[PDB]
Design a protein around this ligand. Structure first.
Ligand SMILES: CCCCCCCCCCCCCCCCCC(=O)OC[C@H](CO[C@@H]1O[C@H](CO[C@H]2O[C@H](CO)[C@H](O)[C@H](O)[C@H]2O)[C@H](O)[C@H](O)[C@H]1O)OC(=O)CCCCCCCCCCCCCCCCC
Ligand code: CLA
Ligand code: CLA
Ligand SMILES: C=Cc1c(C)c2cc3nc(c4c5[nH]c(cc6nc(cc1[nH]2)C(C)=C6CC)c(C)c5C(=O)[C@@H]4C(=O)OC)[C@@H](CCC(=O)OC/C=C(\C)CCC[C@H](C)CCC[C@H](C)CCCC(C)C)[C@@H]3C
Ligand SMILES: CC(C)=CCC/C(C)=C/CC/C(C)=C/CC/C(C)=C/CC/C(C)=C/CC/C(C)=C/CC/C(C)=C/CC/C(C)=C/CC/C(C)=C/CC1=CC(=O)C(C)=C(C)C1=O
Ligand SMILES: CCCCCCCCCCCCCCCCCC(=O)OC[C@H](CO[C@@H]1O[C@H](CO)[C@H](O)[C@H](O)[C@H]1O)OC(=O)CCCCCCCCCCCCCCCCC
Ligand SMILES: CCCCCCCCCCCCCCCC(=O)OC[C@H](CO[C@@H]1O[C@H](CS(=O)(=O)O)[C@@H](O)[C@H](O)[C@H]1O)OC(=O)CCCCCCCCCCCCCCC
Ligand SMILES: CCCCCCCCCCCCCCCC(=O)OC[C@H](CO[C@@H]1O[C@H](CS(=O)(=O)O)[C@@H](O)[C@H](O)[C@H]1O)OC(=O)CCCCCCCCCCCCCCC
Ligand SMILES: CCCCCCCCCCCCCCCC(=O)OC[C@H](COP(=O)(O)OC[C@@H](O)CO)OC(=O)CCCCCCCCCCCCCCC
Ligand SMILES: CCCCCCCCCCCCCCCC(=O)OC[C@H](COP(=O)(O)OC[C@@H](O)CO)OC(=O)CCCCCCCCCCCCCCC
Ligand SMILES: CC1=C(/C=C/C(C)=C/C=C/C(C)=C/C=C/C=C(C)/C=C/C=C(C)/C=C/C2=C(C)CCCC2(C)C)C(C)(C)CCC1
Ligand code: OEY
Ligand SMILES: [Cl-]
Ligand SMILES: [Cl-]
Ligand SMILES: [Fe+2]
Lengths: 38, 32, 36, 63, 341, 36, 31, 30, 36, 334, 34, 82, 33, 37, 30
């Protein structure tokens, strides 16, 4: 059975995942364009 | 003064044990 | 005490004069390079 | 070096020094476990902190 | 080239501000500690948690603004924005002290990120990581003072609030309640910080006043090439100077600069230990033998008893306003006071 | 069959002097608290 | 309410005016 | 006994100074 | 790139901070936080 | 030559194990007298009526102190700023009671240390060195003058100079905050930046030079043996330390001139401690820390306390208890 | 031939623009009466 | 050497720079001004205005005393102000 | 038992000082060969 | 000035160490009862 | 404390026995 703080818990969990996602999606994207050359 | 009389032996060994350690390492250094 | 005061006055005075005279004894030339 | 009976018996257990699976091996699987452990620790920490309150869980000496 | 390796390349690019993997932890958490401090000292009160104004908005100045700790009633709550106390309400979060945990915890992870940054850059450039090791001392201080100490106490209320005068308050609390000056672990930290300042000044002055003449100008700064092979100052004359001024001198350049790392880093570590003690009220508050004598002999007086009388004055005169959640009521007649004042 | 990882150990005079000062000053600091 | 508008107005102006003033040089960013 | 202990430790340090100055390993230019 | 002499921007910038800072010191005496 | 010249040459010899010099001629006797008196008084001196109220404070080990509580106690408030040499007392017993050893120790010590500073200049001249080490030392010396001479002058009594003891130092600091709100004084805040920053830059420089030692030794010996005393060359790679530190922050927040870097290490703590010595010296004349007590008030006029008001309640606790028998009138004006 | 938008660029604006905005905020506060 | 970017001495002496920043800077400043002058900052952050620290006749402080009732505790004190 | 307090320190030193002296001479002997 | 020519190395072999430690320990064991009294 | 001292010394002797036997200078012929 689900309480308010568990719904809180999931919110922040989801919230933190999305933040992670943007950052690494943004970054992989960029690093794929601006590439070192050898 | 009503001090802790175990303080004397604590202080004495606090000093003697580590000092001896140092002296021993130093002297065997000077002898090689 | 009177005896103490005099003895200290003389001790101090002696040490003061050594200080003054030593610096007057051409202190600028006592250096390792130029004796002006 | 010295051979012993017990040594000979153990000898295979200490024989693959430096043996490795190629490249990335099970790293993706390990990260999944790590992430799972993290959230599991977060749940334990927050129950103890009373930031997460669950039905029937009374974090109090009265348990 | 895997995508991990392409991301690695870009994160370790030589740019004006090196990023790195550690950057992914460092830049967000540091920005948000900073930003939450600026935001809270500029706009947020401490009225519901402390009975105090604490922002420019309320008319505080740069000395008296703070992000103040949460009310004692919050215990050691993480005070997450989405948690049970504030329930996602940003305005109520601010009012209950969420910015304090916000700053504290992002700051903690930002210091982690900085140390890993020191490790990450040392490895790429190829030097030993003694700077990162040195940074363990600031980290121990921060963890001990801001996290451990309040976790041993009744709540986050009694941690340091993030402000100039708020910290001064903390200093004096620690005197009146913990007798922290009497604590040998602080005494050692004092020795290490004042000894580090001493080392800093005497090494700088020694180098500047033993330089070789390597240019012909009066400004001596222009006579140094970072690529030169030669020492820019004289270890030999420096050594003789201090041997005859002070009796002993350094002779080994490596030992001297290792000693400069060691002294302050070791002092802050020792101070951290004592605060861990005070997390538990495990104080060096008293000397039992003096108290036995003093209680019996009303003519016995030392600077140690004089200081306790001052501690006693601090506790009683400051606790009612400092710990408002206790509703301390002290009638005038119980307040300790010497004659006249 | 003598063990080849054996190493000789050293402590020079300066290190002895430093280490003795450390111990003695620590004793002088902590002793008041040991007597209490 | 009405105040969320005025506090962002100068911000947005500031943004367009630099966005219009640097837009061509930014289109460079193409390799 | 406590007074004697404090004074003894203080006196050993003063002797340590003497040896550390006058009986140091001389710094030599090798 | 370089159409405005650096010394001019410096003076301008400087006088600009002096104003804001000066204003904050005025505020210490006026209104909120002036004790009045 | 003649006798006075042999003597002058000995005094200023750069070959004495310890340099004497003309400043040394004053320094040696004054420090010896200060040291011998301090050691004897600390162990054996009887209680001293510091505040002039016939309430003697025991400072010495034989009268029930330990290393932490013991002190040489400042001279009596009854004396104020009067000179109280031994010969001005009717007996050593009177001199001990009124705190005479304190005057003797601090005067001989300020003199001795003032000459220690001159000695640092003097030897640097005989050695052909540049002269400003002694300038660095002026910061600590200035600080000692403040707590032992200047603050007693402003306040009118050596009884308010700093005691010569561990706990006595704390007493002096707590009373000071109560009477001058030193925490809220910018010169003291500059002192803290001085010493904190000095500790920081101390750890930084050491860490950064140690980080870039040139491999000149094996893993089994101390790295230190990779440096030989008087070696022509340098044993660390300053260019590599810049390469590390320039990237840690950014390239121009980092020093690449060894001379500029070391000048900075000298100036930061020295300047800051100059300011905090000047802070004690000006609070000596009751120009005190910022006072923001009841500075915030609401539309009606209620006082809305700040952290400055909370400090003030601690200060007040110090104020009303310190020297609890010494005040007869409601204001403590010095 | 330089870029104009860079990581550095982002670094300076994440700081500078909140800083200016805060400065006007604080400026206005000087005129609040009680 | 150079990590590649445009030198600062170069940008801020540039005209294009000040074309762009003669606008953005003062605008940001005014945005902040308005944030306080509109009275918005007060309601966003829950900061008392000079007239809302106390009720007209009260002298005690709205100190929060409960951990989970705390949001309700603050809201009920804000009722008694009117 | 009501025993002489200093007996403890006396015993410890009595053992420690002479023992430490022998060890010092032994170890510096081994470091020669 | 010459270094002093009368200096000599000192030796204590391992057996002498064992013997001397036994002496001290057994002396300690015998007199400890009388020190405590 | 007396009990602990007595037994401590007795324990050191037993340890010494162990080293004097198994860790002796091994006698070597001529
Ligand atoms: C070094 C470099 C490392 C880098 C650091 C990186 C930073 C990581 C971030 C740290 C996270 C800290 C959160 C700690 C929360 C916490 O503790 O929160 C505290 C809670 C316990 O809650 C407290 O509990 C107390 C006791 O209650 C109990 O007792 C009562 C009896 O009176 C009642 O029965 C009550 O119901 C019952 O719960 C009171 O209720 C307090 O008000 C309430 O806050 O524990 C919990 O969350 C968990 C407790 C389990 C241990 C968790 C380990 C961390 C804690 C370290 C403690 C060591 C220091 C101790 C020194 C002292
Ligand atoms: C380095 C970045 C970083 C870090 C370390 C933190 C860390 C923190 N933040 Mg901050 N935050 C960040 C960036 C960051 N934040 C940014 C960019 C913002 C702006 C949006 C914020 C805004 C913010 C607010 C407003 C608040 C925090 C809060 C917190 C704290 C609670 C975190 C929490 O419970 O998350 C829970 C979520 C996670 C731990 C994410 C877990 C990641 C996923 C879901 C794991 C699932 C893995 C899966 C099972 C396995 C897959 C494996 C993989 C290989 C695929 C914590 C100290 C709170 C705080 O300080 O309260 C006092 C709070 O209120 N943060
Ligand atoms: C974290 C908190 C903190 C920190 C970091 C500091 C830091 C400092 N405080 Mg502040 N202070 C604080 C809290 C703090 N304080 C609080 C809470 C209070 C209120 C209770 C005060 C009240 C206060 C007062 C009242 C004073 C300070 C002073 C100082 C300075 C002391 C160091 C100094 O004077 O060096 C300067 C160097 C010296 C004093 C040393 C001189 C050395 C002489 C010349 C040589 C001595 C030789 C020796 C006898 C023999 C050695 C021989 C040996 C080799 C055998 C420093 C800037 C002091 C200050 O500014 O003094 C100027 C001062 O008087 N503080
Ligand atoms: C108050 C004293 C003090 C301060 C302010 C300070 C500051 C700093 N020290 C640093 C470094 C160091 N400090 C060192 C030794 C020491 N540092 C010391 C004392 C201090 N050090 C002492 C005494 C020592 C001796 C052991 C070393 C060895 C280093 C370094 O290598 C490093 C460096 O490069 O400096 C040159 C820098 C770390 C940069 C960083 O984390 O960026 C990232 C920023 C983060 C993670 C944000 C942290 C948020 C903090 C923890 C909480 C919030 C703070 C609020 C924003 C402001 C609150 C203000 C109120 C308190 C008034 C930073 C400049
Ligand atoms: C009994 C009675 C009568 C006694 C009086 C009692 C009295 C009150 C005494 C009490 C003493 C007391 C209790 C002491 C307490 C001290 C205390 C708290 C101990 C701290 C303990 C401790 C381990 C702390 C941990 C932190 C720590 C490591 C601090 C170390 C501080 C320290 C030693 C710093 C060094 C200070 C110093 C003077 C440096 C000298 C260096 C020097 C010679 C530089 C010159 C030099 C510079 C160059 O640049 C070059 C190039 C060359 C060549 C060169 O030479
Ligand atoms: C450009 C580069 C961008 C860099 C951004 C970097 C940001 C990090 C730097 C932190 C800045 C900390 C300074 C904040 C001080 C401040 O705003 O005070 C702003 C306050 C505003 O002044 C206060 O305003 C109140 C408004 O109600 C009342 O009027 C008060 O009486 C009045 O004191 O001013 C000060 O207190 C005086 C100046 C303090 C200067 C401190 C020197 C710092 C060293
Ligand atoms: C309108 C408002 C009113 C305006 C008022 C203006 C006030 C500003 C005053 C300006 C003072 C001038 C700077 C100081 C002198 C200087 O240049 O030094 C000379 C050297 C030369 O630098 C070196 O310069 C060299 C070139 S040369 O020597 O200049 O020729 C070069 O080789 C080297 O790389 C470089 O580092 O500077 C350096 O070594 C760099 C470090 C600078 C350190 C700052 C000065 C001392 C700090 C004391 C502060 C302590 C704070 C207290 C802490 C609690
Ligand atoms: C809603 C979510 C929003 C995203 C969330 C953010 C998470 C990621 C944080 C990372 C922030 C830094 C990104 C900036 C990258 C960069 O400047 O590229 C930005 C690129 C390319 O810059 C390039 O910059 C390069 C230099 S450098 O890499 O910036 O150092 C240069 O080499 C190149 O030629 C030039 O074109 O150009 C544009 O943005 C112009 C439009
Ligand atoms: C009011 C605050 C203090 C203002 C002046 C403080 C200057 C800093 C004091 C340094 C104390 C350090 C003493 C040792 C350090 C020491 O030896 O420094 C030496 C260092 C460099 O010496 P030079 O001989 O190259 O230059 C000084 C003169 O010779 C002029 O060329 O001096 C400075 O850089 C002077 C800066 C004056 C700027 C004013
Ligand atoms: C010395 C004392 C240090 C202060 C530096 C003095 C700079 C002065 C200096 O010596 O040279 C100034 C330097 C030179 O820039 P340019 O090469 O563009 O200028 C060339 C001109 O000098 C020609 O006249 O510019 C800077 O580096 C600007 C710094 C802004 C940096 C923006 C920082 C924002 C990033 C966040 C901070 C870093 C994060 C750290 C880790 C988290
Ligand atoms: C918290 C939070 C957050 C974030 C935030 C941020 C990020 C912020 C930012 C902020 C910022 C980032 C700000 C800044 C500001 C700044 C300022 C406020 C400055 C000022 C300064 C000044 C005033 C100075 C000046 C001066 C002086 C004083 C003296 C010397 C000279 C000079 C000129 C330097 C979020 C979103 C998550 C949400 C939740 C919460
Ligand atoms: O601070 Mn309070 O003030 Ca300067 O004097 Mn009046 O009392 Mn007393 O003797 Mn020492 O102390
Ligand atoms: Cl007092
Ligand atoms: Cl009076
Ligand atoms: Fe150096």
């Amino acid at each position: 059975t689900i309480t308010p703080s568990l719904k809180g818990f999931f919110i922040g969990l989801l919230s933190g995942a999305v933040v992670l996602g943007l950052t690494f999606a943004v970054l992989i994207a960029i690093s794929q364009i601006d590439k070192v050359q050898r | 003064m009503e001090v802790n009389q175990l303080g004397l032996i604590a202080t004495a060994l606090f000093v003697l044990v580590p000092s001896v350690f140092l002296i021993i390492l130093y002297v065997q250094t000077e002898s090689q | 005490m009177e005896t103490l005061k005099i003895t200290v006055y003389i001790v101090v005075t002696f040490f003061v004069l050594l200080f003054v005279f030593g610096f007057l004894s051409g202190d600028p030339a006592r250096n390792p390079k130029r004796k002006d | 070096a010295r051979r012993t009976w017990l040594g000979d018996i153990l000898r295979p257990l200490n024989s693959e020094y430096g043996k490795v699976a190629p490249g990335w091996g099970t790293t993706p699987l390990m990260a999944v476990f790590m992430g799972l452990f993290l959230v599991f620790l977060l749940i334990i920490l927050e129950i103890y902190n009373s930031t997460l309150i669950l039905d029937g869980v009374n974090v109090s000496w009265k348990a | 080239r895997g995508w991990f390796d392409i991301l690695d390349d870009w994160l370790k690019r030589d740019r004006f501000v090196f990023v790195g993997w550690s950057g992914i932890l460092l830049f967000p958490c540091a920005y948000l500690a900073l930003g939450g401090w600026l935001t809270g000292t500029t706009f947020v009160t401490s009225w519901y948690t402390h009975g105090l104004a604490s922002s420019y908005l309320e008319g505080c100045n740069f000395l008296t603004v703070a992000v103040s700790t949460p009310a004692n009633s919050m215990g050691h709550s993480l005070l997450l924005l989405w948690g049970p106390e504030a329930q996602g309400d940003f305005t109520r979060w601010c009012q209950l002290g969420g910015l304090w945990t916000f700053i504290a915890l992002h700051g903690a992870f930002g210091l982690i990120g900085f140390m890993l940054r020191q490790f990450e850059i040392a490895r790429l450039v190829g030097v030993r990581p003694y700077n990162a090791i040195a940074f363990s001392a600031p980290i121990a201080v921060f963890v001990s003072v801001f996290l451990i100490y309040p976790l041993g106490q009744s709540s986050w209320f009694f941690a340091p609030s993030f402000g100039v005068a708020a910290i001064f308050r903390f200093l004096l609390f620690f005197q009146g309640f913990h007798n922290w000056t009497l604590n040998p672990f602080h005494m050692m930290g004092v020795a290490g910080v004042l000894g580090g300042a001493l080392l800093c000044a005497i090494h700088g002055a020694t180098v500047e006043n033993t330089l070789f003449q390597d240019g012909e100008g009066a400004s001596t700064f222009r006579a140094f090439n970072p690529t030169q092979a030669e020492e820019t100052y004289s270890m030999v004359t420096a050594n003789r100077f201090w041997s005859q001024i002070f009796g002993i001198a350094f002779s080994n350049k490596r030992w001297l600069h290792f000693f400069m790392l060691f002294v302050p880093v070791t002092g802050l570590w020792m101070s951290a230990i004592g605060v861990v003690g005070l997390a538990l009220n495990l104080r060096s508050y008293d000397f039992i033998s003096q108290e036995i004598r003093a209680a019996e002999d009303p003519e016995f007086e030392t600077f140690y008893t004089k200081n306790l009388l001052l501690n006693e004055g601090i506790r009683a005169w400051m606790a009612p306003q400092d710990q408002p959640h206790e509703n301390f009521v002290f009638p005038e007649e119980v307040l300790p006071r010497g004659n006249a004042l | 069959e003598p063990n080849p990882n054996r190493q000789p150990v050293e402590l020079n005079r300066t290190s002895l002097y430093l280490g003795l000062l450390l111990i003695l000053v620590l004793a002088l600091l902590f002793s008041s608290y040991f007597f209490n | 309410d009405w105040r969320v508008l005025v506090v962002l107005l100068p911000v947005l102006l500031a943004a367009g005016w630099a966005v219009r003033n640097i837009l061509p040089y930014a289109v460079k960013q193409v390799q | 006994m406590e007074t004697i202990t404090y004074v003894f430790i203080f006196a050993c340090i003063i002797a340590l100074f003497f040896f550390a100055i006058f009986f140091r390993e001389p710094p030599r230019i090798t | 790139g370089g159409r405005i002499p650096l010394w001019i921007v410096a003076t301008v910038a400087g006088m600009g901070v002096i104003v804001i800072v000066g204003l904050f010191f005025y505020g210490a005496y006026a209104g909120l936080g002036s004790s009045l | 030559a003649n006798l006075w010249e042999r003597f002058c040459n000995w005094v200023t010899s750069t070959d004495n194990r310890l340099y004497v010099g003309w400043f040394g001629v004053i320094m040696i006797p004054t420090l010896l007298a200060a040291t011998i008196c301090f050691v004897i008084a600390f162990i054996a001196a009887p209680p001293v009526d510091i505040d002039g109220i016939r309430e003697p404070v025991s400072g010495s080990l034989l009268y029930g102190n330990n290393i932490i509580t013991g002190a040489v106690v400042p001279s009596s408030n009854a004396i104020g700023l009067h000179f109280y040499p031994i010969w001005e007392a009717a007996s050593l017993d009177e001199w001990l009671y009124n705190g005479g050893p304190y005057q003797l120790i601090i005067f001989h010590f300020l003199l001795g240390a003032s000459c220690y500073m001159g000695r640092q200049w003097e030897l640097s001249y005989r050695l052909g060195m540049r002269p400003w080490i002694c300038v660095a030392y002026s910061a600590p010396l200035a600080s000692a003058f403040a707590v032992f001479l200047i603050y007693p002058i402003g306040q009118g009594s050596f009884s308010d100079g700093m005691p010569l003891g561990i706990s006595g130092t704390f007493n002096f600091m707590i009373v000071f905050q109560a009477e001058h709100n030193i925490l809220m004084h910018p010169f003291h805040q500059l002192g803290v930046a001085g010493v904190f920053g000095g500790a920081l830059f101390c750890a930084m420089h050491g860490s950064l030079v140690t980080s870039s030692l040139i491999r000149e030794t094996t893993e089994t010996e101390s790295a230190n043996y990779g440096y030989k005393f008087g070696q022509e060359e340098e044993t660390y790679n300053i260019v590599a330390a810049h390469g590390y530190f320039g990237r840690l922050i950014f390239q121009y927040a980092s020093f690449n001139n060894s001379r500029s870097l070391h000048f900075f290490l000298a100036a930061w703590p020295v300047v800051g401690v100059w300011f905090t010595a000047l802070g004690i010296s000006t609070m000596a004349f009751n120009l005190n820390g910022f006072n923001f007590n009841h500075s915030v008030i609401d539309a009606k006029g209620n006082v809305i306390n700040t952290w400055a008001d909370i400090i003030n309640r601690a200060n007040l606790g110090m104020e009303v208890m310190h020297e609890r028998n010494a005040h007869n009138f409601p204001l403590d004006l010095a | 031939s330089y870029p104009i938008f860079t990581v550095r660029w982002v670094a300076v604006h994440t700081l500078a623009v909140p800083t200016i905005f805060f400065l006007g905020a604080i400026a206005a506060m000087q005129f609040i009466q009680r | 050497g150079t990590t590649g970017e445009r030198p600062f001495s170069d940008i801020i002496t540039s005209v294009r720079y000040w074309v762009i920043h003669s606008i953005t800077i003062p605008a940001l400043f005014i945005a902040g001004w308005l944030f306080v002058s509109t009275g918005l900052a007060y309601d966003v952050f829950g900061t008392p205005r000079p007239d809302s620290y106390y009720a007209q006749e009260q002298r005690s402080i709205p100190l929060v005393t409960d951990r989970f009732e705390a949001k309700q505790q603050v809201e009920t004190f804000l009722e008694q102000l009117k």
